[PDB]
Amino acid sequence: TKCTLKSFTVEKGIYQTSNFRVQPTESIVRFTNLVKNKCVNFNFNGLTGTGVLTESNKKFLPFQQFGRDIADTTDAVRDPQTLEILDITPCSFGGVSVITPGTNTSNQVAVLYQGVNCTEVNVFQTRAGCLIGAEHVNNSYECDIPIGAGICASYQSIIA
């Protein structure tokens, strides 16, 4: 956060500092074996990309090979070896935000991975994303540092 803000003192707040990427683990070329449910680099008949290949309920017509959504992005594909339909979910990219009080007060921080489930990264799951380093409490206070979706963080340790 100090590196991003170009300052040695950080004011109390939430600062988006980095971009979480689910790194591709394997390379699947189908024209090797096929690996599903993982963020892999797929190469299907010259069409390459990175994604999670899951089972699809979309029934393609026999002449069709790839699938596109409204925004013309490839979200469905057919494996050439075995004629099955696979959904290509994009890997869980997210924004890494750092929630901290003032450095005059404390050096404790919490990390928010925006729009990322907590199983794909004091760990709490919010609709905004996964918050690591903040203890979730059942009490309600005024909002000090906004997290989102009704979640706020404060220092009293860091609580959400």
């Binding site: 994009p90 990219f93 924004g95 925006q114 905004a128 906004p146 009704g150």
Partner: peptide
């Protein structure tokens, strides 16, 4: 493609 939608701070229930 790098696009994310941040949720609003106030949910519809709180509004």
């Amino acid at each position: 493609n790098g696009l994310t939608v941040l949720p609003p701070l106030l949910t519809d229930e709180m509004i």
